[PDB]
Amino acid sequence: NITFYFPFGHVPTYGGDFVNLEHIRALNKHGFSAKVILMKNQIPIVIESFPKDIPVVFYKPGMELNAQDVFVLSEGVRIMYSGLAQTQAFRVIVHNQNPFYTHTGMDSAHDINRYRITKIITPSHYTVKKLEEMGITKPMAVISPYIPEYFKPAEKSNEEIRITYSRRKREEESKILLFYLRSLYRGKKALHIRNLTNYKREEVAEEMSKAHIYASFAERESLGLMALEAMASGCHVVGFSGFTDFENQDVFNEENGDWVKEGEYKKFAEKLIEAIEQIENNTPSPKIENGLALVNSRFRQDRFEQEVVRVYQDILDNLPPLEGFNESDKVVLDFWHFD
Amino acid sequence: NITFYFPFGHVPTYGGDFVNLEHIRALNKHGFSAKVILMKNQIPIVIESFPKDIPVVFYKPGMELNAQDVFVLSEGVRIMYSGLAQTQAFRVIVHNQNPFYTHTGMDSAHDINRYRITKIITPSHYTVKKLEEMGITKPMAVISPYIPEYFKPAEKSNEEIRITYSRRKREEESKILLFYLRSLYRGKKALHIRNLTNYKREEVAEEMSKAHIYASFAERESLGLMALEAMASGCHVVGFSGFTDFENQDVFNEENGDWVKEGEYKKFAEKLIEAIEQIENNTPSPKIENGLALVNSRFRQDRFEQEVVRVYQDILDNLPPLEGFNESDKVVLDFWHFD
């Protein structure tokens, strides 16, 4: 009789927030008990932002949960760690979806290593290695997010070349690259380039579905979701991989994208021009087919649901003993006083 | 009877603005004629911000200059290029101090190559190669800025270790690095780390003068002035070089800094710890001496003044013929209508 509680303090916003809702949904679908605990900002705009099928409990100082319950913490929100250090009750899992933001939740690896974390769930084997590089020695698990089914190819134009890119990361580097592209491209046809930085996620899917090429400005990725979305959409991916230490991941390779290294703006533009000429000649890259096959095999919902069940059941099968409590004991939560 | 006109539209702000004032000062000191032309914002706060020894002329639609005069344009401020394309009078030099911002002034290399630019002055041989990589074929020259004399070593503490760094660039990467440093450093002593991002330039000099180590977050540099300031101050420089294509510059090398590559946060922290232990043991790096010698020999005011005279005289000795004007003819400037 264990519930997994996922703390939120705001409307779901970041990629990471939406993944956590998918964790909750998969858990509840497959016989587990999972809920949002909304720690603060208990106002209608926030409350109403959680879909109907997501259970929400409100934090109130003095409420009681069960000693056996599990908190699934972000790598951020330091205050969740300091509060829960006030009791011996509960288990703690960290869902670290952003290894380079580990500094937003905990002071150092030492503090993580001394905390009663039972497991760290990560998006990728790369993330595991990055946290271990940082000095973290806690047990780790991988559950990669999935690409929603509405990312898929649509018919692409046979008379104009459509390129899309995001400036969410590397805003200034996209301007540099596009300057090289304008400087080096000598083909006849005008290029159709669209910045999708501020599109809604379904609009991103729509734009990619019709795009021939996705110019990648990925940066310090865990998995590389934008690129995988592009691959799901049948786009040729050209540009930054998101991994300076590219050798520490095995999702992206020479056969599913034209990757460049930091600062390689000329090579980036040259690869774009090569990709443009392939589309102009109606001989699109075989890297598109490889990218499609990658997403189909590894990054859709069925496999995610399998991995959620596997990983969370393994955690439930391997919990530390409760110190100072029995299962079913009620425990007051009064560790936070928010505005 | 040639005057060099340096356009400004605001109080001197950026590094580049202050370098241009030093160009003006050197030119006027050594027998040339150079002035600011203040294009707009002719209000006391702006007017008063120019030092007394900097000549300032105000743009007014309908004013006259001499056909032979030379405009020294920034790589930015597109409107200066479009305006001056309305006449055959004048010569144009570009002082491109920021090659990665070339996109802020001109659409492409093609547009630069077709413009009547007589010479592009740059901060470094690296910058020359970068612009040429981009497809620019105009003649180029190098005048490196100098480090002001108030950057120099002061006595440094023998009992605490002082590190300084800037977040002007790579704001988020400094947090990542400091997280690795906190995670990996196991020495006794508490570190004295100061962020100087918002210090005045003289305060930067003061802080560096007392600092043992400068942690470098340089990014897409032309020359690497912050690092050179640190070297002038007797700091050990550790971290990012500012040059992804490090092989295309020859200022920084293994003997004057502990440079790391992109994403190498662990190696960065490890080099910092090595530098900390050297200071703790009173055996500071010989790279400090090499850095001092570099600045003394190449980056002080006397050499800058030599290079200004050399480069600008070479330009005056090699001007294109005036088309459609004689020397001494008056030419109306009415190409801009600013707020």
Numbering used by the authors:
A (entry chain A), B (entry chain A): 4 to 342
Q: Please, what does the article write about this entry?
A:
The crystal structure of the AmGGT protein was determined to the resolution of 1.85 Å. Although the AmGGT protein was mixed with isomaltose (as an acceptor), no density corresponding to the isomaltose molecule was present in the electron density map, presumably due to the weak affinity of isomaltose for the AmGGT protein. A substrate-binding groove is formed at the interface between the two lobe domains. Although the asymmetric unit contained one molecule of the AmGGT protein, the gel-filtration chromatography suggested that the AmGGT protein exists as a homodimer in solution. A dimeric structure was generated according to the 2-fold rotational crystal lattice symmetry. No protein degradation was observed with the E135A-S185A mutant protein. In sum, the AmGGT protein is a homodimer with 2-fold rotational symmetry in solution. In contrast, at 37 °C, the catalytic activity of the WT protein increased, but that of the E135A-S185A mutant protein decreased. These results suggest that the homodimeric structure of the AmGGT protein contributes to its thermal stability under physiological temperature conditions in the porcine host. In the AmGGT structure, the side chain of Tyr16 protrudes into the substrate-binding groove, narrowing the acceptor-binding site. This bulged structure likely prevents the binding of glycopeptide substrates, such as the Glc1-peptide, to the acceptor-binding site.
